[PDB]
């Protein structure tokens, strides 16, 4: 097993961590979803699929930056949505090709009441997320940390 | 000054006693504070004339004197500071697992063990097939190494396993590591179709390709089995090294059932099968060592 970002940045056997640049809209109005589409940005594959069965979940997922302080919303993982910040493991994710498959998180996020101006700056931090990887074959358990920044500015209107 | 001594038995267990001609003087050393006479366990730090530590390294005191215990990979040399030194030098400052590599950093020695292990530094678990060529993961009494399977194999002596042993009943359950095939268990692994009911098991298993020429390394090979009236339904996958001598070293490791064995050829180590019967014509074929 090992990952990589859609910018090529990639953390080999041992676990580790990446930097996960993603676009985002220029601005966006309160009640609206901002959309952070992640399936699209992490992607992994398994090195010995003939045998081991390895099991893939987000342990925690929690907001930074911008997000923690001017946003709330969910996190959809593998179709189902969850709170974000997180507070339960999300269910497991089979891996069984060399194939690169993509790593099924998109982030929801609605704005709330705000004075206006830039709440996300471009260079900003706005998400972690740790994989947790196991297996159905030994005590496999590695951690993938991602950390997720903002490639612009996200303007939030007053309202 | 006010510390005259008549005798050494005036001096406290926190304080140095010299006898310069049996006159007695108690003087306790810098990480020590009093008169000289009695003195508390307290840091040279803050004495009176204070201390000389660098700013980034913390003053503490230890048993004779006061010590600046610079952040690690940098030690004191009195008079200039912290000076860099490469800690992992010195077997006073680093004390890693013999397999790890020191490596220095800003303000700590790490001992990191070569790429491709998995460990935090102390206990690099390595795998199986992630060493370099010639060697392979291998346990040693409590730990994971890497080691040339050429001379941690085990070996098997199991005339069980020859393709013509039908009679009997098996399970290759217990098989895992590095094997090898002596006697009359044969030579090398079996590289064709054994028939249902032989090989002492109920369905026999068989290499699916040939063994590699001398001194290849570790390469992954296909396996297949032998149940009902098809051959190779189910296939698996197996590495072989050779080894200097002339034989193989086989990764044997359990089947998915408990009526799976692994046939062996017969070592063949004559041109003509004289273990076989003058009137069982014996067939000194290329490939195919056989009497009929
Ligand atoms: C081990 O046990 C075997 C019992 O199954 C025994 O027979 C072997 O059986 C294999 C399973 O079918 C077979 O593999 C496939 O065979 C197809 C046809 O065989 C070709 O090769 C023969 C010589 O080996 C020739 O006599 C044939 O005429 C034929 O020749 C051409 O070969 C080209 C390249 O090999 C192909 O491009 C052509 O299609 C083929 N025909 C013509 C007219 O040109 C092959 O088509 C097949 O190709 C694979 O790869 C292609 C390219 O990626 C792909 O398009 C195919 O779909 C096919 O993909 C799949 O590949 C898997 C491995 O990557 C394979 O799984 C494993 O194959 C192993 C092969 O040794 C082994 O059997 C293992 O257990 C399998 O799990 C899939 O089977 C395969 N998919 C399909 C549908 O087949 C591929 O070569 C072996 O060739 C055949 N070997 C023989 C007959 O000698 C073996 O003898 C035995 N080995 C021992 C004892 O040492
Ligand atoms: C004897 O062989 C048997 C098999 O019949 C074996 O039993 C199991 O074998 C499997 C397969 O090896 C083990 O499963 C995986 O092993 C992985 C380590 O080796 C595999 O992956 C390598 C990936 O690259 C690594 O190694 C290279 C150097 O080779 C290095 O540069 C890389 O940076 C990286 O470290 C691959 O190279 C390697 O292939 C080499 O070795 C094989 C022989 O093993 C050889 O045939 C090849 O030609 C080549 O030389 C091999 O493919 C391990 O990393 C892996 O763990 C990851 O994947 C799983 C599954 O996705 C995840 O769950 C896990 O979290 C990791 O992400 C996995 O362990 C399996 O462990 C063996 N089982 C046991 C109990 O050992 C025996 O062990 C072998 N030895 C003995 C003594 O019997
Ligand atoms: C005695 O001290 C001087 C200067 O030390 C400074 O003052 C101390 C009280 C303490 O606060 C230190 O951290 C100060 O730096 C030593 O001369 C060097 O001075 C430079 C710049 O001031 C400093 O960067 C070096 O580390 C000092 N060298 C050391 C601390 O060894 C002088 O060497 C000291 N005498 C010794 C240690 O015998
Ligand atoms: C704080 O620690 C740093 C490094 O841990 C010290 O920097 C070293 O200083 C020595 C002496 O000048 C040099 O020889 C090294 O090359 C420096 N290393 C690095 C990484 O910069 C620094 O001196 C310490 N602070 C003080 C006040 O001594």
Same mark, same amino acid.
Request: with cysteine; charged share 15%; aromatic share 8%.
């Given at each position: ?159 | ?13 926190? %304080?140095?006693? *010299?006898? $310069? =001609? ?7 050393? #810098? /990480?020590?504070?009093? !008169? ?115 001379? %941690?194999?085990? *070996?098997? $002596? =199991? ?7 039908? #009679? /009997?009943?098996?399970? !290759? ?63 698996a996958s197996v590495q072989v090294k050779a080894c200097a001598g002339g034989y193989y070293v086989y990764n044997l490791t359990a089947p998915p059932e408990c009526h799976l064995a692994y046939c062996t050829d017969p070592s063949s180590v004559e041109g003509t099968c004289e273990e076989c019967s003058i009137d069982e014509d014996c067939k000194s074929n290329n490939g195919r060592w056989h009497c009929q």
């Amino acid at each position: 097993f090992a990952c990589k970002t859609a910018n090529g940045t990639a953390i080999p056997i041992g676990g580790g961590s990446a930097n996960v640049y993603v676009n985002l809209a220029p601005v966006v109005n309160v009640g609206q979803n901002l959309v952070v589409d992640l399936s699209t940005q992490i992607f992994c594959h398994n090195d010995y699929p003939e045998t081991i069965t390895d099991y893939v979940t987000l342990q925690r997922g929690a907001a930074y930056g911008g997000v923690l302080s001017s946003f709330s919303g969910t996190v959809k993982y593998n179709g189902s949505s969850y709170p974000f910040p997180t507070t339960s493991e999300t269910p497991r994710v089979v891996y069984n090709s060399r194939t690169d498959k993509p790593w099924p998180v998109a982030l929801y996020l609605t704005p709330v009441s705000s004075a206006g101006g830039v709440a996300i700056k471009a260079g900003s931090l706005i998400a972690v997320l740790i994989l947790r990887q196991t297996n159905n074959y030994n005590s496999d358990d590695f951690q993938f940390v991602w950390n997720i920044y903002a490639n612009n500015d996200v303007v939030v209107p007053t309202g | 000054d006010t510390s005259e001594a008549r005798w050494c038995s005036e001096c406290h267990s926190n %304080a140095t006693c *010299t006898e $310069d =001609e049996a006159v007695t003087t108690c003087t306790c050393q #810098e /990480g020590f504070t009093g !008169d000289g006479l009695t003195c508390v366990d307290l840091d040279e730090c803050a004495i009176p004339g204070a201390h000389n530590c660098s700013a980034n390294s913390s003053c503490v005191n230890t048993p004779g004197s006061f010590s600046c215990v610079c952040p690690e990979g940098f030690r004191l040399s009195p008079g200039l500071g912290c000076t860099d030194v490469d800690e992992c030098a010195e077997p006073g400052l680093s004390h890693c697992h013999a397999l790890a590599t020191c490596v220095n950093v800003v303000g700590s020695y790490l001992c990191v063990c070569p790429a491709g292990y998995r460990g935090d530094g102390w206990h690099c678990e390595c795998s199986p097939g992630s060493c370099g060529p010639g060697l392979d993961c291998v346990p040693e009494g409590d730990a994971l190494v890497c080691a040339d399977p050429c001379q %941690a194999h085990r *070996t098997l $002596d =199991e005339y069980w396993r020859s393709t013509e042993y039908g #009679e /009997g009943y098996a399970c !290759d359950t217990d098989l895992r590591g590095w094997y090898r095939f002596v006697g009359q268990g044969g030579a090398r692994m079996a590289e064709t179709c054994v028939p249902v009911l032989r090989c002492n098991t109920a369905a026999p298993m068989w290499l699916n390709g040939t063994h590699p020429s001398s001194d290849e390394g570790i390469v992954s090979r296909k396996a297949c089995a032998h149940w009902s009236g098809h051959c190779c339904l189910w296939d698996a996958s197996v590495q072989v090294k050779a080894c200097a001598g002339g034989y193989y070293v086989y990764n044997l490791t359990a089947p998915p059932e408990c009526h799976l064995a692994y046939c062996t050829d017969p070592s063949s180590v004559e041109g003509t099968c004289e273990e076989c019967s003058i009137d069982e014509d014996c067939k000194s074929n290329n490939g195919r060592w056989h009497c009929q």
